[PDB]
């Protein structure tokens, strides 16, 4: 069976005091890290602070990793550097980086190759916009997005996929647990037909839309949804209840 | 003017190499009131580097977000840097202009955010080989500087860096005399836009290839007030470069 994966994407948020208060509440929740992956993604400069405050049961990672190795690349964090610091996870291809920072499908591929070459576990994001879904091209876009990097996957416990319904984020539309499941089933079929049936049943596929304390249990209930990449709700203390649904 | 020597470690370093490198840096005795020395480690190394370096050394980060706090995955805001007492930020580095789509407007917005949050900024600019061969050095630098220069309210807190991109990775050399004439022109740009006393106050650093041999010939020039050092800042011999500014 697939080990459930609950991830906190703090994005560009937090202070030293707020993280101190939030990580304390997180630590009050008791769980087994061998049956459940719970990962926190703070700002890079908050990593050391966050890793020191969170108990060993919690996994940690960074929100981006360089497509370049060590060298003359100002502002970059290489996969080499991350591994030396024992950073376990990286987020690759988040919609906000594709939208605001020119991150292409090829950047996503180069980042994944760098991460897996350096023994990093990768959380890889993808999803279609509103205009793409209205043109009935949901599967076509996601297939193009997944096939950009899927051949690089050597271990299917170490690569975690995240579907982002960009058609239901900021647009004013809602994505039901059923509508997410239908895409998740397609993603697993894409993995199956390109990598194998056993590999597709190994790989975790998360829902990376608006997840809160109310809908998390109805989302995790679906057969092909193995967890979430949580945004705004992971900045609140009630994030422990979202972890409770996958327990 | 107070001299300013900066170590841009770029995308380099391990935990062990940094503790070895910082220890050798700690060996050098200088007065931080007479000379600014700033180390810019990778973001995930910042806390490690700050703990190991003695308080005489200033520290900073190699990039800062144009956005404030919010839904911007992978970004470090100026607000977050201020809360961590990160003193300095690098803005407009050629490598981020080249590989990461960073434009003059991004630089402006980054300087806007940094100054609002009481951060000190090391702002980079410079022309390509094509631009120099077309004799457009002054035109390009005027536009690059005028993109942000009006935002400076404190001329000790904003530091300019000239990167001669025509000399980096091409096979052509930049002389201290060539660097001086550009630095003089940059100061003339600041004078026309901000004032005479302000241009006399602002530090302008050479951001090309600096090592233990050329540093003293560069810093002796009247309009070059220090360096942004790349590769040579990764060696223990970086102390000799700091010594040339002493």
Swiss-Prot record, chain A:
The active site is at residues 94, 164. Pfam families: TIM (PF00121). GO terms for cellular component: cytosol. It catalyses: D-glyceraldehyde 3-phosphate = dihydroxyacetone phosphate. Pathway: Carbohydrate biosynthesis; gluconeogenesis; Carbohydrate degradation; glycolysis; D-glyceraldehyde 3-phosphate from glycerone phosphate: step 1/1. SUPFAM superfamilies: Triosephosphate isomerase (TIM). CDD domains: TIM (cd00311). It comes from the Eukaryota. The keyword Isomerase applies. D-glyceraldehyde 3-phosphate binds at residues 9, 11, 170, 229, 231-232. One of its GO terms (molecular function) is identical protein binding. Gene3D superfamilies: Aldolase class I. One of its GO terms (biological process) is glycerol catabolic process. Changing residue 72 to A: 3-fold decrease in substrate affinity. Its EC number is 5.3.1.1. The keyword Isomerase applies. Keywords: Gluconeogenesis, Glycolysis, Isomerase. Belongs to the triosephosphate isomerase family. Catalyzes the interconversion of glyceraldehyde 3-phosphate and dihydroxyacetone phosphate in the glycolytic and gluconeogenic pathways. HAMAP family: TIM_B. Homodimer. This is Triosephosphate isomerase.
From Swiss-Prot, chain B:
GO terms for biological process: gluconeogenesis; glyceraldehyde-3-phosphate biosynthetic process; glycerol catabolic process; glycolytic process. Homodimer. NCBIfam families: tim. PROSITE patterns: TIM_1 (PS00171), TIM_2 (PS51440). The gene is TPI. The active site is at 93 (electrophile), 163 (proton acceptor). It holds the Pfam family TIM. GO terms for molecular function: identical protein binding; triose-phosphate isomerase activity. It catalyses: D-glyceraldehyde 3-phosphate = dihydroxyacetone phosphate. D-glyceraldehyde 3-phosphate binds at residues 8, 10, 169, 228, 230-231. One of its GO terms (cellular component) is cytosol. Its EC number is 5.3.1.1. The keyword Lyase does not apply. Keywords: Gluconeogenesis, Glycolysis, Isomerase. This is Triosephosphate isomerase. The lineage of its organism: Eukaryota, Sar, Alveolata, Apicomplexa, Aconoidasida.
